Amino acid sequence: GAIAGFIENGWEGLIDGWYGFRHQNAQGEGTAADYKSTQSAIDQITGKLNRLIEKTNQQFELIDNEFNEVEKQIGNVINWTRDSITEVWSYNAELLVAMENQHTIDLADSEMDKLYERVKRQLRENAEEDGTGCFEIFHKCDDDCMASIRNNTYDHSKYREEAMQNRIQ
Amino acid sequence: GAIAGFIENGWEGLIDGWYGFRHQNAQGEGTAADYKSTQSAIDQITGKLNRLIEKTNQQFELIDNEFNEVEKQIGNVINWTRDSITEVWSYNAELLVAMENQHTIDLADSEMDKLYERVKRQLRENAEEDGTGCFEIFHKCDDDCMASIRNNTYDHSKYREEAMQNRIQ
Amino acid sequence: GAIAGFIENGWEGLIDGWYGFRHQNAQGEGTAADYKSTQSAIDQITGKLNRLIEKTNQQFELIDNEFNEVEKQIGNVINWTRDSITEVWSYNAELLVAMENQHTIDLADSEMDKLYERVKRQLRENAEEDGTGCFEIFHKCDDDCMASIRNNTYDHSKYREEAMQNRIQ
Amino acid sequence: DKICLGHHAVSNGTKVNTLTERGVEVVNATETVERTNIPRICSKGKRTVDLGQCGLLGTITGPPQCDQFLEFSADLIIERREGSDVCYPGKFVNEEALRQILRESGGIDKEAMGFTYSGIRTNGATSACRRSGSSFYAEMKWLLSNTDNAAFPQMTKSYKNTRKSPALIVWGIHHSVSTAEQTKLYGSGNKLVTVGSSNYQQSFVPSPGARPQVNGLSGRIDFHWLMLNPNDTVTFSFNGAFIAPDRASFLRGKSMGIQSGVQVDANCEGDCYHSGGTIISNLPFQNIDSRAVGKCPRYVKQRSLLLATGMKNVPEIP
Amino acid sequence: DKICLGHHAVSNGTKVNTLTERGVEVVNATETVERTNIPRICSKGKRTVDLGQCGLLGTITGPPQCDQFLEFSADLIIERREGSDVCYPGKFVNEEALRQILRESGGIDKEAMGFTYSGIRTNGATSACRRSGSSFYAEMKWLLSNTDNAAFPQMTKSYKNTRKSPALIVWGIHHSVSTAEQTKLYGSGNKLVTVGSSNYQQSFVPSPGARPQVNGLSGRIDFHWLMLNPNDTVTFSFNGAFIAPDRASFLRGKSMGIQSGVQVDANCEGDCYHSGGTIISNLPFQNIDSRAVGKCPRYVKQRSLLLATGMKNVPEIP
Amino acid sequence: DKICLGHHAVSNGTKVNTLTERGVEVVNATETVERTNIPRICSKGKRTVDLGQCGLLGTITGPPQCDQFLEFSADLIIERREGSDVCYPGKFVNEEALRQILRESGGIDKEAMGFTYSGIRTNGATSACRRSGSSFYAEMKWLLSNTDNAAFPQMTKSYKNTRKSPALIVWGIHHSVSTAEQTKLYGSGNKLVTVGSSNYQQSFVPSPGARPQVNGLSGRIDFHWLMLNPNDTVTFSFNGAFIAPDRASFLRGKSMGIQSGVQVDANCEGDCYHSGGTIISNLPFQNIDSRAVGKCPRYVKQRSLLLATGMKNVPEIP
Numbered sequence A, B, C: 001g002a003i004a005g006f007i008e009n010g011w012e013g014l015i016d017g018w019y020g021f022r023h024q025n026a027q028g029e030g031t032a033a034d035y036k037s038t039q040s041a042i043d044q045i046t047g048k049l050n051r052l053i054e055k056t057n058q059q060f061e062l063i064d065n066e067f068n069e070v071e072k073q074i075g076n077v078i079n080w081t082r083d084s085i086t087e088v089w090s091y092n093a094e095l096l097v098a099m100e101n102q103h104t105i106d107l108a109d110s111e112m113d114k115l116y117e118r119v120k121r122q123l124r125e126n127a128e129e130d131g132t133g134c135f136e137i138f139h140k141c142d143d144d145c146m147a148s149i150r151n152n153t154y155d156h157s158k159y160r161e162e163a164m165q166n167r168i169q
Numbered sequence D, E, F: 001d002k003i004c005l006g007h008h009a010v011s012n013g014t015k016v017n018t019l020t021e022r023g024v025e026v027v028n029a030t031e032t033v034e035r036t037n038i039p040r041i042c043s044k045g046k047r048t049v050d051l052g053q054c055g056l057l058g059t060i061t062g063p064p065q066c067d068q069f070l071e072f073s074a075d076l077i078i079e080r081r082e083g084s085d086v087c088y089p090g091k092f093v094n095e096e097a098l099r100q101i102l103r104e105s106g107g108i109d110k111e112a113m114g115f116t117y118s119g120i121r122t123n124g125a126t127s128a129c130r131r132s133g134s135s136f137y138a139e140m141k142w143l144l145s146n147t148d149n150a151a152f153p154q155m156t157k158s159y160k161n162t163r164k165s166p167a168l169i170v171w172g173i174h175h176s177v178s179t180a181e182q183t184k185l186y187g188s189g190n191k192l193v194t195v196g197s198s199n200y201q202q203s204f205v206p207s208p209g210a211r212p213q214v215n216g217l218s219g220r221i222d223f224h225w226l227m228l229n230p231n232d233t234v235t236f237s238f239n240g241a242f243i244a245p246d247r248a249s250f251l252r253g254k255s256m257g258i259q260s261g262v263q264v265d266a267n268c269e270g271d272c273y274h275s276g277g278t279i280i281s282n283l284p285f286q287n288i289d290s291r292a293v294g295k296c297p298r299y300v301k302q303r304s305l306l307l308a309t310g311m312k313n314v315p316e317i318p
């Protein structure tokens, strides 16, 4: 009946956000989503989306004919030019999507780390990393205390004595 | 009258470098720039600049005429080809700049983190992170001690006893 | 006769892997490679390699003649088109390689950090960072203990008392 | 007590590609390559003509099929495969260039050239251009001798473009089935037709000879055209086998022409066309037709390129 | 006690480029630009013809050089610089278009057109087309008057393409050294040759006149060609100076043609060619020939682009 | 005691674009798209000719306007809109191909072809080519009969290119206003001019007829050209209406030609030109002219693309 954070697995139950908190205390287990980190990620992804929606104002008109085929020589030059250009955009499209996808994935992992590092800095010397993306808190942290961490209102000075005592022995 | 590092804000007073140190002790407050990290960033940015200055040796000559317009069919083929190529370089230019800019920004944030992590490793167990990019030093650190951190000559073994005592109680 | 990890230098003796462990204890000094991190990196690099091996099914045929030169006007249009396209692929090739190389290097540094951070999380409060990529272990760690870290079977709870005592005084 | 940081995930994962991996699952992805086609010509907001049986070049010379379009106006011009520029068998010289010109003309405005003739028939007609009875091209005059085998007088007709736009001028050379038939119509002797401008100079000779029967006829009228600059003049010196123009053409403005085999819709609004219909999409790429025209997404070889719109999907440990 | 994390490195470092650095050393790198050429035409698996002295256009008309290839079949066609389309001096009209057609024809299937003549010689031969003795193009007939200076009767010959593929038809106009020599062969009077189809109409006149001696001859035969649509007909009306076809050509299927000056190899298997040989490579780019054809890596200006296949090389502190 | 790590920032922030954000502020940025134009032709270091009223094709035939350039030499050739290839009304056949050739010729070296005539006038002149008095093209000879309506003898003139480079040869066909005027000059009967080489064969007939008056004249001289291979020969067989060449042209080396309407500067040094001036820039892109020639940055649609040369600008908390 243990819980685990990121590092080898996500949460299929987190359905109100992209990133979130999962705790267990005397009151039981809870899972809540973080808005700021989730929104940051969504804004960046849609930022890419709008970028690829930017339409072209370049208008192109017919250069050959599919009812009455044009002269062979100029026709073959046209086809060779079009095919050459088609090769280019296919490459560009392939590379653009592959590149953007690699970046989308990475920035998502980045947002996870920023959130983790933030919470680590909140708890100061009152907790230790378990290596599964979770923090073992060395003091009593009720649901109200858990909420204080989620909204960045946790004052480590309040629990510092209690935690260090349990940590040291 | 508190000071803060990176993480929600930069320093408009840091005017002799890109990255720097800001301290406060009994002697007062001070701000100095780090050379190695600043230079690393500048060398990388100008490295991009030189890359985009590399001129082409490809010479192109006139293919049509703006005094005496060429034949319609071959003229329209030419225009369609040029427009097609113009569409490509415009896309490339847009993507190149957008991509480079995303990387320039990221490597700059990277250099900030490397500098922060370096100082964290210097202070060992003699300081704690406040979460604003600053280190609360748990011993007396005069201007000379502050300088020792900036030039990587800080010996944590010297202040270890004094710091841990203050940290623990 | 000291040892150092990453951060200012690699290991020319590590010849059975990309990333590895180097320890020194009473039994002496040892160097072993990590499989999971090395394999992760190799799989990503070859993943790029296969991507650039994907051949084109686009067939192109002759559009001019090098025995009997075609008509000047259409010939110059062809040459101007080819040169224009050659300029594009040369640019693409230059950018693709430059871009991939920057990413290959970065993901390699990333794998190094992930391995370092993993080991840091294994040792918990039983070790301290020396700033050269190494961990000063504050307890007795024989070759068997060293192996326990390399295969992720190190239980920090076992050595916690012994280590904290030495760390604190 | 414990607090854990995490990220969402699904069992509904979709595979995409990166620089390193191929088929790496992400939470959510969207398509970048359009394949969804609308099999109609979306013409809402655009003044549209469906020439149908009228060939685009026929709008200038005027076979019966194009009588409705002799002075048409349009934003969008549609060519149909059944269209024909011709009633009496023949073809235009530099046809495709002329098509490309008319496709972006916005239509044509015709103007009488004011040619008058003497000692000559102008009522040259044929069974191939039936309009009520036997007739001829509406904008052209088929000139004959007068009776039969009679001599066709040397003539010289000129026309100045008194307007501010270039004038599209079209004339025809008639190729009889035999020198016997050529003589019967325009008299004996070699026939010459010269066309002079101030930036154009050409010459034309008929080529009487047996040819396959098209519409039952072995005769050919091949059309020629030039653009007359403002205030410039064309001169027609001839002595037979000449298809004279009655009116000149002027381009109305700007348009776009397409070739299609699908119906029109005045409710749907589009801006990218091909022979199979209309492409309406915000996607940057498409895999429908390389020869699509208008304002279009770029054509690519691949039918699908998924863009990740979510993080890497990592399944929960059960 | 101490444990250190590290990465491997070498003294054998190789420099590559990135967005920021130029010449940054990495552990291992590979080449992306092919420069390794195979100076042969790799033809394994492909049916190959080395026309040698036979010009590609000569396979249709049939000079002695091309007698082996009058009905050739191929997957890969190779042109040689010494090749010639001609025995009796002359050249094709729209030659390059015709070459481009035959290069992907897969070869040609010839069919008799069945022309019969009366009151006329057909055994027109020359010293330039020596085949045993003086001869002429194998698929063509050089028509004369009958004796000398005698009148050449007006003729009209037709041919229908009763097949499902277009028919390649070729005829020739003979240009004599003088009007004296033209008269001696085809009789006096102006000469006309008209060629009629159902989508083609042209006319041809000889141009007798002095020209430089080629193969000792000042006469010229310039060839013309058209493609005949299925069930369509060509008609030849003429009165002299006409080089008549004996057989028509039909394209067999699909192939690829190259120009080369290097030998063939039936053991090596390739798919990308140039005049200097074959390019076999999995590399995405090449720096050998911009005009390489087949399925090829893209041509680039740069001779080398190294792709890092290893981490950044950082030397060990001694 | 406390130590803080930080980075600089400004209130002078400049917005750029990335893959994700649009308008994200950075500390410092630079422009990548050139728009700064120099409205002159920077010719320092380059041998430059400003043909002015002389058309480029006129340098070969030699109207009065081009007398200074009959054997010009250059690195940079500049065409002007007022330039004309013609004194006596007419135009070149395949003019643009010929222009493209001369633009990179480095100039021309003329050589006498050595034609001698008998029983014929060569002093054909006109009011349109006034040079002191009425004259003609400097490199050409206007051949007449002798008196008036007199018969023009059939002639045959040849010329061998004894040099190592191809020879640019140019001749003209004269088109009279009437058959009456054609007869008055060259005598009665149909006129033919044949031009024979060893890789070229063509024929030419005059087209007398009424045309609009250009420079007060209704006559037309349309020029034709070919390149003569080394040791090869051209032959001119004719009987009137022929504009004979006096000298041949040889290309000097290598150059670049531009069309412009702006002055020249011998102090400024450039390598990229357009009609509006010179582009000097280290920037990879430009938004001035798509048809710029020389060694140029690539043309793009966008007027500005800012490249971040500094970190993301994050304002200090006050």
Ligand SMILES: *[C@@H]1O[C@H](CO)[C@@H](O[C@@H]2O[C@H](CO)[C@@H](O[C@@H]3O[C@H](CO)[C@@H](O)[C@H](O)[C@@H]3O)[C@H](O)[C@H]2NC(C)=O)[C@H](O)[C@H]1NC(C)=O
Binding pocket: A049, D028, D029, D030, D309
């Ligand atoms: C999986 O990814 C897709 C693609 O990003 C997400 O679907 C997208 O959802 C948004 C909002 O629901 C749509 O935005 C829409 O924009 C139009 C035009 O501006 C507007 O009229 C609509 O009212 C709406 O705001 C967007 O079009 C839509 N994408 C597509 C291709 O239709 C989807 O939400 C993602 N999955 C999850 C679980 O979020």
Ligand SMILES: *[C@@H]1O[C@H](CO)[C@@H](O[C@@H]2O[C@H](CO)[C@@H](O[C@@H]3O[C@H](CO)[C@@H](O)[C@H](O)[C@@H]3O)[C@H](O)[C@H]2NC(C)=O)[C@H](O)[C@H]1NC(C)=O
Binding pocket: C049, E028, E029, E030, E309
């Ligand atoms: C330095 O980089 C190169 C390039 O990645 C490495 O050489 C590569 O080695 C692999 C395996 O040894 C080769 O894979 C081969 O594939 C072919 C075709 O699938 C197969 O038939 C072979 O049996 C082999 O599995 C790969 O081709 C080869 N690269 C090249 C360009 O030949 C090299 O290993 C790297 N250096 C070190 C020290 O690893």
Ligand SMILES: *[C@@H]1O[C@H](CO)[C@@H](O[C@@H]2O[C@H](CO)[C@@H](O[C@@H]3O[C@H](CO)[C@@H](O)[C@H](O)[C@@H]3O)[C@H](O)[C@H]2NC(C)=O)[C@H](O)[C@H]1NC(C)=O
Binding pocket: B049, F028, F029, F030, F309
């Ligand atoms: C904001 O970004 C711009 C662009 O990088 C910076 O301006 C640049 O400053 C450097 C040095 O001051 C200039 O380098 C110069 O190179 C030329 C040619 O090699 C040399 O002759 C000069 O003596 C100088 O060394 C560079 O050209 C210049 N950029 C431009 C476009 O002119 C600027 O410094 C940045 N802002 C700050 C506050 O640093």
Ligand SMILES: *[C@@H]1O[C@H](CO)[C@@H](O)[C@H](O)[C@H]1NC(C)=O
Binding pocket: A069, A070, A071, A072, A073, A074, A075, A076, A079
């Ligand atoms: C141009 O490409 C189309 C695409 O299949 C082809 O059908 C057509 O024949 C090509 N044009 C010529 C002149 O071969």
Ligand SMILES: *[C@@H]1O[C@H](CO)[C@@H](O)[C@H](O)[C@H]1NC(C)=O
Binding pocket: B069, B070, B071, B072, B073, B074, B075, B076, B079
């Ligand atoms: C080529 O493009 C230019 C740019 O406006 C245009 O003016 C010109 O008419 C085009 N050429 C033809 C033959 O239409």
Ligand SMILES: *[C@@H]1O[C@H](CO)[C@@H](O)[C@H](O)[C@H]1NC(C)=O
Binding pocket: C069, C070, C071, C072, C073, C074, C075, C076, C079
């Ligand atoms: C096309 O480019 C080749 C490459 O050098 C050149 O030799 C050839 O002359 C060019 N074609 C024309 C028509 O100039």
Ligand SMILES: *[C@@H]1O[C@H](CO)[C@@H](O)[C@H](O)[C@H]1NC(C)=O
Binding pocket: D231
């Ligand atoms: C119009 O044509 C006349 C002669 O037909 C000419 O004199 C005049 O210069 C031309 N232009 C104008 C604007 O009148």
Ligand SMILES: *[C@@H]1O[C@H](CO)[C@@H](O)[C@H](O)[C@H]1NC(C)=O
Binding pocket: E231
């Ligand atoms: C074939 O040609 C004949 C006349 O030669 C024509 O009537 C017929 O429609 C053509 N097509 C077929 C399929 O018979």
Ligand SMILES: *[C@@H]1O[C@H](CO)[C@@H](O)[C@H](O)[C@H]1NC(C)=O
Binding pocket: F231
């Ligand atoms: C030059 O021309 C002559 C005939 O005019 C010919 O015999 C010779 O082969 C040609 N070439 C050389 C190098 O003399």
